[PDB]
């Protein structure tokens, strides 16, 4: 048991085999490799280096099993804690570096400045301690879904001037404060206490139940997530940043700049000012919201929205029972709703309305992930489905006027449908749900575009079916059949065949109107699509 007394500099050496070194003067260049054999969580340990009040340790290396205890008024310079060593800090530590399960506990009254947490190292600031000028490079390599709180920085006290690099993680517990942080892309900070003055230069900030975040700026690639029961105030959403406010979250004094994404629901609280004026999402009522660049507003059941602008890259999602009036969707805006929602506004091509009370819609335009669902007994008129838009019809839906499908458009049919107007398909219609449906239209105009249909080639003469009611089938439209019966079994067709397009009440079809997209064989037969004199089209057997 060496005792370095005051003004007696010890200037190299090691420490082993549960031996203590009591420092009252100066002890440079030590190797502490004893005292922590039993693990950080036991008062059963003997050995290590103990810097007393007024003592100094410079360029110590605490390696596996080594324990360095700095008491009140001691100091530890340029310390390397690695490979499962630890430092218990009640005084001053300057320029510590933590590698591979090296730990630093800064207990009440302790102060650590310049700690670099390098990989699988850990700095725990117990309540009443202070960490200043920390660099965190680890803790967050498992992604936003990693629940790792065992490496990185955990604060129960206070952390000032922290830089969080890729893979770095800061957890602020209930009692904790983190003031002035810069969080780069790949790194994150989890806030359960107080985070104040945070710069997300592509970094992530999670604000959980009972966490307060004040003065966060979200630059490009950054993310502020306010969970239920968390609260953020005075956030600035710069271009290509997003603020996420969950049901039960507080977002007050939000500055949504141009290019800023806002993702929230009427079940949260978001007050602020965007590039068009003031906005409020409060108590189930949103007024003035501007969804762009990945922003989403969900108007849940029995809430309301007015003066919403859905711009290119934004999404308005109105649940059934929600209302949203004076909507303006610019070309490239997405609208998700069904015939039980109530929406009014204007889109890229004029006025539109969904009246959830009667279940009739008129003039929709579904682009870029927009979607509408016509529920049972509903009716959508003059629909325009664009690239990446979807129109789904529940069993018992109706169409009215001209249903136009642009290239890249989807229309899914989950049961029998009647259009009392014109379907114009340049995209893809698809009979899905194993029951077979009938799509009745007055006129079909094919502009390319497959209708994906289903067939049983197993002795049934059973299939999906198109019906031209009184009108005409023109253009060119591809038919894609899938055999849903017993495969490798093919039965012969009987007489005229499986009727797939039925012309009725005087309907005519043109002669190159329909065409098999790919061959249809089952078992020993090739199934061929043939138009006859009755204007109807049939599936028949080959050789
Ligand atoms: Mg701990």
Author numbering: 2 to 434, 453 to 562
Give the authors' words.
The best-characterised SAAT, antigen 43 (Ag43), is a protein that contributes to cell aggregation and biofilm formation in commensal Escherichia coli K-12 as well as in major pathotypes including enterohemorrhagic E. coli (EHEC) and uropathogenic E. coli (UPEC). After translocation, the Ag43 α-domain (α43) is cleaved but remains attached to the cell via non-covalent interactions. Similar to α43a 13, the α-domain of all three Ag43 variants folds into an L-shaped right-handed three-stranded β-helix, with each turn of the β-spine comprising three β-strands linked by loop regions.
α43_EDL933 crystals belonged to the space group P212121, diffracting to 2.98 Å and contained four molecules per asymmetric unit. The α43_UTI89 and α43_EDL933 structures in this work correspond to the uncleaved α-domains. Present within the structures of α43_UTI89 and α43_EDL933, their AC regions consist of three β-strand rungs capped by a β-hairpin motif. The first superposition predicted an α43_EDL933 functional dimer stabilised by two interfaces, each consisting of 12 hydrogen bonds. Conversely, when the α43_UTI89 functional dimer was used as the scaffold, α43_EDL933 molecules were predicted to self-associate via one interface also encompassing 24 hydrogen bonds. Although both dimers are possible, the double interface dimer results in a 550 Å2 buried surface area, compared to 260 Å2 for the single interface dimer, suggesting that interactions such as van der Waals contacts are also important for dictating the preference for the double interface dimer.
